[PDB]
């Protein structure tokens, strides 16, 4: 039965992100005076069947990989830990409940850096490791500010157990006590999934299959960190008896942060590798480490400190 | 057990999906693009590695202030405040000296 | 006579000063910018339904070129090949002898449309309204000699949209 | 008699050629205001 | 008249034969820039037919003009401005030998 | 037969697919880039279609050669389309593209991108109303559902 609630967490996330791409495409074009994808399918609902029919029917092309073995890995990394993070988060009750399931969703977070540095090294191509550089140095700057700021928010949580977190948010929702760090943290998830303004347009090396699994595994993150904000703090009721109420109002939340990334990337433009670490270095880090500070000081100085257990 | 199986199961599920998409698609016959990599022959800019090892030092850092949220239960409550006020400060104090200093070039 | 874009100096008001960080450190524009955005979302969309709905098109638009005849069914040109000589791309080729009645009846009135600009001098240069851009813009081929159009290929498409191109004539030979 | 496309009788009507974008949004000193009010009830 | 470059016809032909020098040590090079599958022999085999192809020129201003668009087709080709098929061009490949024995001409066709 | 019947459906579905999706890359190389982006622009919507401006060539199904083809830029279009993965299909858009238009007497324009790449739909007008050149694509749809790869794969 184990089996059948990890074949229902796996499954599931990865025909959403099908239709993710396909509600991208309409909600941007309707943001654009546009109907999106109307053809294929009512309401382009079958879009996303066509996309995957043509790219695993695609020629695949070689790119004359340094090292196959390292460059099929990437692929195989970024997909895996993207559907790793989504065991421990709290729908109502997680798959796997760790009483440090926060530090566990920052490392996963950390390797899947990894596969980014993998794709450009072994694609011999000096664009891609230029690019891919890029990529690292970006991931680089919003790890720490995400750190940063789950650990001051988790100062109010009292543990690093996502499960907590419901608890803690029962009365009143966490970003009004610390809506600051929700602006930075948004802002820092936006970066770290390299959506846009955080693009870096112009390892696309990858021919189809592999490149539609790494688009894929790129889309699952942006679901998951949407729904990790949400748990953070947009905190839902739950009622013991009936989970079902948390896990409509959940997801609810999680659509309506992935359709604010999809909004944010069709409303500015795209920033430079520059003033991106211009912000996440002497904008956001000063921040965050005073908010750090404050959130310290604060329980204490209010008598508030969380319990332990 | 349970979260070894939730391993083994995404590593599996990935890796087969790695090879429905890198060996089942290149079986279909296209011709043959009888076209060599031309390649006819190195920016180690400091500018990337600054990034890099202050990235490692803050992480350091953060990793020194990651146990705060179960240090907030002692009883010694000044003493381990003044403790990760010092931690905080010291990491504002490496951003400053590099941001006055020639860093955060980025 | 002109006017000073930007050129704005700054209040150093500590209201104004007050207002700017609130914008800078809020993120007040672009939030402004983001409801714009959502704005448009709500508005109806502009996408026609092609092909089952077509764009708005004027009367006195050019596409594939035609070749009328007159109300008795004699064809109205009578090789005098000034739409040949004004062609600007020289995409026209006429070869005309005498018919067997003895009129000046082209032998060959071939146009490669792979080569011609659709400027409409062709119609404009005809004295006898023979060569006249038709209403067809949807005429698209797949191999590139169909472009290149005979004569029977012109008298075949003038007397295929031949009503059409009357209607349209009979609403602007007047502008003209 | 002439029956050219011209100008209606006195003219067409007036035609906005100035930027219109408004203003909104509270004071700098009521939107922090607002800000910290939400800050001390979620402390509280 | 002004000279372009040279004064004499002897000046001329240094300037020449520093053309010649930089494009006789660029050809291993440019083979293997642009992967020619011409060899070295070949494409120095070219460079000095074509400047022999320009030996009967007597006038030192022609011949620094010359050498100045011998420099530029050598600049391009060093910077790899030109392209593969760019420097394929100057072997002729593709188009059919055009005889030159006047029977064979005649058989050809009408060509004077 | 069955076998036959199993690989139409399975021919048919992948057809589907491929004309559902179609990928274009924008060649964009004069005045009927224009029309290309107004046929993009809100009133025509390409994306409706599915036929979304993949930029990346590498992961484009369809060139749209818009454009005067310069012998300059000829090699660069060549280079490019052979670049290209497959299924790749070339649509040439424009007067310019089709036979040189305007300046096929030129002495540095390509008369004709067909003698560069082969061309699958040829646009006709200068510059082809953005209706025609969805016209084209959509007359590329139905080239591409005509197709029976798998059927002559079975058949042979
Ligand atoms: C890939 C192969 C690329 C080959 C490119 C070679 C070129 O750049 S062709 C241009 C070369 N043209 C010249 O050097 C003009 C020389 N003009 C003359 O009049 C000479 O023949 C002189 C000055 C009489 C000297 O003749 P000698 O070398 O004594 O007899
Ligand atoms: S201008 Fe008119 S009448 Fe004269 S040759 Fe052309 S089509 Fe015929
Ligand atoms: S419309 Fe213009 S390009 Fe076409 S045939 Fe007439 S003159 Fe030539
Ligand atoms: S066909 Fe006409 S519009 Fe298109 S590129 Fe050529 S001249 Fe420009």
Known sequence: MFMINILSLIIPILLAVAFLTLVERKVLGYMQLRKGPNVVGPYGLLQPIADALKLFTKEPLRPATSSISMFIIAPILALSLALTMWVPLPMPYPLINMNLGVLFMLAMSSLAVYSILWSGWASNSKYALIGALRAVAQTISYEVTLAIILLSVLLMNGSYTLSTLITTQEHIWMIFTSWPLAMMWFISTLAETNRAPFDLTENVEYAAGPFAMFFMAEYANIIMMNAFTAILFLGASHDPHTPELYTINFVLKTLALTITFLWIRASYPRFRYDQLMHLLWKSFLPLTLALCMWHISLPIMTASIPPQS | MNIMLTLLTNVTLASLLVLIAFWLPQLNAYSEKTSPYECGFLPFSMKFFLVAITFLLFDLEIALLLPLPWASQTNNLKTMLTMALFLLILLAASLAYEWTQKGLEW | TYKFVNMREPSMDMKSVTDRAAQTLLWTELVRGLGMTLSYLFREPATINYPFEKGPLSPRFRGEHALRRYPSGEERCIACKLCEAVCPAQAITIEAEPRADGSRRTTRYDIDMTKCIYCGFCQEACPVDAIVEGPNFEFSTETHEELLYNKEKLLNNGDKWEAEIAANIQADYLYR | ?44 | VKPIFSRDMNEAKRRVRELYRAWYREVPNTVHLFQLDISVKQGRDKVREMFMKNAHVTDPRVVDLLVIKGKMELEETINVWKQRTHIMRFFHETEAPRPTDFLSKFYVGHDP | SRGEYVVAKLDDLVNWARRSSLWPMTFGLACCAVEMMHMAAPRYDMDRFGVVFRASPRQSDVMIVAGTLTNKMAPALRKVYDQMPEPRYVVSMGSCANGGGYYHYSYSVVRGCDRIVPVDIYVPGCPPTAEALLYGILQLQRKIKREKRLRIWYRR
């Open chain 4, 1 to 44: 008699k002439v029956k050219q496309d011209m100008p209606p009788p006195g003219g067409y009507g007036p035609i906005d050629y100035k930027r219109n974008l408004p203003r909104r949004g509270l004071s700098g000193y009521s939107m922090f205001a607002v800000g910290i009010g939400t800050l001390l009830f979620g402390y509280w």
